[model samples]
Target: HMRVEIWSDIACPWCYVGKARFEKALAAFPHRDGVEVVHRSFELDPGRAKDDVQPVLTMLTAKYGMSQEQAQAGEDNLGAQAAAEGLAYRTRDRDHGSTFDLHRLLHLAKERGRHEALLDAFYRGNFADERSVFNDDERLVELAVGAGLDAEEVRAVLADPAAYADEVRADEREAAQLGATGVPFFVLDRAYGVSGAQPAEVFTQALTQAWGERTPLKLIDAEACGPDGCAVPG
Candidate 1:
């Protein structure tokens, strides 16, 4: 058996792209059914509060300090890469704000054995549709319910700051300690960290390596994605 923990944010375009790629490699692994995958939180933009929400396209350029033309060009390239992984990347349709609450929502999903579902649902809503995930209580609840969580329980978690907030914070703190400056950070068997959106081949390597050793582990920074697109070989 292997344990894999992924640190990512819902607002990240490449995180979900990496998500699809990682899943492909996982599915390709023979013992994937015995693997345990957990989702952790990494707020890409901690200061992106809901009080000043903005268009994702605008935020994309500002987040990366690229002009509108440069941002669009980069996004076009990214959209193609993401498309190869069977996911959509819609920049203009997305929204950006602090993702702290969404992280909290994931812990609630963790309680219900649907953490991945919750995370996936948010990415779909953010990129595939112009869903109001940040500022609307009803929207978050709907996402939770769509992922098969109890609506009342979802409401409860949202209403209480103490609910899963600690877990979310702990995840972030641990990520910092691990030098994960950015995300889609992947830790396998508590032994190896697959940083960024490494190719599916690297994910397969980590899966096999972690399964073999069952021992120790350890991605970085950007406006989105892991520390680097290449996982450091251990």
Candidate 2:
């Protein structure tokens, strides 16, 4: 068996698309059943205040020094990229904010074995749905419950700012230690690392390469002894 650790943020569009693309590769992989995929946290807006929410286009334009038209065009291009992977992406009016709480909630979801579900729900809500996913406990609980988590338990976790906070930070700390500076960074078998929203074919290559390197033993035609007997030199 092999393990793949993916570092990503709930607010990252590439991470959303990257998940779909990597899953596409994994589905076609013959030894996919032996693969264990673990999602790690990476906050794109780690320092942004929990309440500092803004329209995605607004954030993008300001951050990148682009005009509204340029930023909208960029989002449109990204939406097309996501659509190619069969993911719905709202090119405009989506909101952006600190995803620390979302990451913490994902830790809770991981504990409940609903990590992927909650993460997908967050992606859908943030990128496709008509609702905002920032600093709103109700919206979060709705998404979490929809992902099969207990609403009350989810509430408790969200109510307390400390719940699963360490786990989220630990994931981010490890990400930094791993030299990761962005989201959608994949580490396969702890041997191969791929960054960004690479194509499914690239993911396939990484998986294949990692799987091949797991067992490095090769047989050479030579005299060898076993419990049966030693080979006689003639």
Candidate 3:
């Protein structure tokens, strides 16, 4: 199987768009079932910080000197891009939070072959329904269950702070060692690196390129990203 790792954040709109694009390419892939896609958490913002509560528009303006209208227009443009990919985005006033726990649960899901479902659900909950990811335990539980996991298992993982947390760290460590400076970074078989929300067509070619030559290139002999750390939600 061609192992693919993607570094992304649940709160990042581009990550949502990039996932959709990558999935589209995977669907068209001739050996789709032979491909293993993994999502690694990338924390782009400060978790549980005061600014995390700001509206998407406000955050943009506050951080990058954009006026309210400009910020809205930028997000609206992003929404348009998502629409092009047949995915709706509703970032507007959506609330976000620390995604480490969410990523931790993802490790559990990966073990159960349910990570993909949870990724879709989280993207929809945050980008389409505009839900608060930071403060909503019920919402997380509901999403996890929707992905076909046992409800008790989902709650159990939440209750146990030690649940798969180190997996999150491991992913972070590898991502940093791989040189991921932002969300939506893709590494195909540890050889090809794709950054940002590139077009589906771009991803399609990458898949083809990787599939045609399924050889893993050694990066730095051994990548110990954190040794310590997306380092996905901050």
Estimate TM-scores for all models. Answer: 0.85, 0.91, 0.84
List, residue by residue over 1-234, the lDDT tens digit for candidate 3.
788889998888999988888888889988899998778877776345522455667667887887989888878888898998999888477655677667777877888998888888888888888566665667889988988888888889988979987888777788889988887999998879999999888998998888888756676533335745513333
Clash pairs for candidate 3: 41-232, 42-230, 42-232, 43-232, 173-225, 173-229
RMSD in Å for model 2 = 6.0
Q: Is candidate 1 or candidate 3 better by TM-score?
A: 1
Question: What stretches of model 1 exceed 4 Å from their correct place?
Answer: 215-234
Worst 10 residues of 3 by lDDT: 221-230
Candidate 3 positional error at 75, Å: 1.0
Evaluate model 3: give its lDDT. 0.81
- Model 2: worst 10 consecutive residues (lDDT sum): 215-224
TM-score of 2: 0.91
Off by over 4 Å in 3: 46-52, 214-234
Clashes of 1: 11
Local lDDT at 37 for model 1: 85
